Amino acid sequence: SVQIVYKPVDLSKVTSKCGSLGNIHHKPGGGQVEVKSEKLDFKDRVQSKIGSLDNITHVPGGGNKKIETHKLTFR
Amino acid sequence: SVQIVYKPVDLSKVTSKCGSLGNIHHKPGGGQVEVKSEKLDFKDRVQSKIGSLDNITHVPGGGNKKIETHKLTFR
Amino acid sequence: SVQIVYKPVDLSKVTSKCGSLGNIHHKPGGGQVEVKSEKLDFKDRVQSKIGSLDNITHVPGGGNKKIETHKLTFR
Amino acid sequence: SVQIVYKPVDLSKVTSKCGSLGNIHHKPGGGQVEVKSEKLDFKDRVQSKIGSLDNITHVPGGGNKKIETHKLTFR
Amino acid sequence: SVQIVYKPVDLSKVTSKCGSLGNIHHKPGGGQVEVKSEKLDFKDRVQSKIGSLDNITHVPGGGNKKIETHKLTFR
Amino acid sequence: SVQIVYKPVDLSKVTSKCGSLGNIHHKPGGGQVEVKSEKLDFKDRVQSKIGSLDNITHVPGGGNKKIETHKLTFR
């Protein structure tokens, strides 16, 4: 016979405290961008991106992450 | 016979404290960018990116991470 | 007695010839401009200019100048 | 008695010839400009210029100058 | 008695010939410019210039100069 | 008695010939410029210039100069 008892006990705290969060500045791509092309040949697919793309400013007041995984596998 | 008892006990604290968080400046790509192309041949796929792309400013007030994994595997 | 004879003779030619004049590009001030000011005191006059000012593109097809001065002064 | 005879004779030619004039590019101030000021005191006049100012592109097809001065002074 | 005879004779030619004039590039101030100031005191006049100012691109197809001065002074 | 005869004779030619004039590049101030100032005192006049100023690109197709001076002075 088989007796399996799973008792994870968790009283944990991922925590933060901040008095003031501010005066943040993200300025990507302030310079000038110039692209000149003459006489090109493409025989397959083309992807182009030109300018200021996919810039992120992420300012979470908290920003706490807790990841927990439980696997109980029985053969 | 088999007796298995799993008792993880956790009272942990991942924690932070900050009086003031600020005066942060991210300025990518302030200079000028110039691209000139003449007489190119491509016979396969092409990917191009030109300018200021995928710049991140990440200012979490807290920013605490806790990762916990439990595996109980029985054959 | 006094005899004064002034005979300037001029058959001159300031001249130009141009087959094609073109494909000219003047781009001042393509970059980004940022001005932040806190807690200033001025006790006299102030002049400020901010941005793209007084840029000239001057493309005279001819552009020929002839300056001629005659002074005949008699005491 | 006084005899004065002024005979300047001029058959001169300031001249130019150009087949094609072109493909000119003036790009001043492509970069980013940033000015931060805190706690200044001025007790007299102030002049400020910030950015892209007084840039000239001058493409005269001809551009020939002739300057001629005649002074006949008699005491 | 006084006889003065002024006979300048000029059949001169300041001249140029150019088949093609082109593919010229003037790019001043492509880099980024940053100016930070704290706690300054001025008790007299101030002049400031910041950025890309007074840049010249001068492409005269001809560009020939002739300067001629005649002075006949009589005491 | 006084006889003065002035006969300058000039059949001179300042001349040029150029098949192609081109592919010229003037790029001043490509690098980044940074100026930080704290706690300065000025008791007299101030002049400041910061960045890319007074750069010249001068490409005269001809560019020939002739300077001629005649002085006939009589006491």
Residue numbers in the entry:
A (entry chain F), B (entry chain B), C (entry chain E), D (entry chain A), E (entry chain C), F (entry chain D): 305 to 379
Verbatim from the authors:
Dominantly inherited mutation D395G in the gene encoding valosin-containing protein causes vacuolar tauopathy, a type of behavioural-variant frontotemporal dementia, with marked vacuolation and abundant filamentous tau inclusions made of all six brain isoforms. The ordered cores of the filaments span residues K274-R379 of three-repeat tau and S305-R379 of four-repeat tau. The CTE tau fold differs from the Alzheimer fold by having a more open conformation of the β-helix region, which contains an internal density of unknown identity.
Three types of filaments were observed that were made of two identical protofilaments arranged in different ways. Filament structures were determined to resolutions ranging from 2.3 to 3.4 Å, which allowed us to establish their identity as CTE filament Types I-III. Types I-III of CTE filaments were present in the frontal cortex, with only Types I and II being found in the temporal cortex.
